[PDB]
Amino acid sequence: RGLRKEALEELMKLLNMKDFPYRIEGIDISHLQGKYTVASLVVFEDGFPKKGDYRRYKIEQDHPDDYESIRTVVKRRYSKHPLPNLLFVDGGIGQVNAAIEALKEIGKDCPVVGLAKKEETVVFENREIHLPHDHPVLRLLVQIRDETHRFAVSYHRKRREKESLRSVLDNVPGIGPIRKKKLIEHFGSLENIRSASLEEIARVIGSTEIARRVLDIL
Q1: Is-contact 43 50, C-beta < 8 A?
Q2: Which of 43, 143, 199, 216 suits 76 as a labelling partner, its CA being 20 to 30 A distant?
Q3: Domains delineated in the chain
């Protein structure tokens, strides 16, 4: 799954970009209360994710300040890395403008586009553009947003997956803490254990009888 060349052309036209959006970078801002904001940065090159170029930025602050976080991210990254042809920010006029002013703060300029927080409305050049549902440019920006979100959500993936696995295993009668922990450490996630054979599960815990119950509950 990538961004269709024809939709990229349509985006180009909408934003009056003179340059084809060959590199698009997108930012999610997600705050961990009392700790730091994690900014997650994705990269599309020629419409496809370039996963090796993905990065995060951490902005230490007890309370959220998404405008400062975007500013900080833009300044940190683009003082070191080349600008993309287009920057996407997951949020509305304020977040887009925060990025633009940060770029100005370091002498830089590139087009910045947003989608207003979950309200599929395009944000560009201090304006909202309200497109019909299913407009191709809307669909394309949502795909970029979905990828920024997917990358953001993956920050806590290993811990979350173990917790979700543990929650299911808590419902297997007779399992016990030691064998529950063995399964969690061995498998890591529900997706992985759901692909295992009875025999693998039985080997991990030393009981085929309990392994059958784990299969029943899965």
Answers
A1: yes
A2: 143
A3: 1-156 (3.30.420.340), 157-218 (1.10.150.20)
Token output for 48: 């496809």
CA angle at 17 for the pair 11 and 18, rounded to the nearest 5°:
130
The label of the residue with tokens 């990025």 reads 99
Identify how many contiguous H helices and E strands the chain contains and give both numbers.
9, 8
How far apart are alpha carbons 16 and 51 in whole angstroms?
A: 28
* C-beta of residue 62 within 8 angstroms of C-beta of residue 33: yes
Backbone angles phi, psi at 32, to 5 degrees: -105, 105
Cβ neighbours for 197, distance < 8 A, ≥ 6 positions apart: none
Q: How far apart are CA 70 and CA 13, in angstroms?
A: 26
**What kind of experiment solved this structure?**
X-ray
Angstrom distance (rounded) from CA 136 to CA 12: 12
CA–CA dist 170, 30 (Å, integer): 30
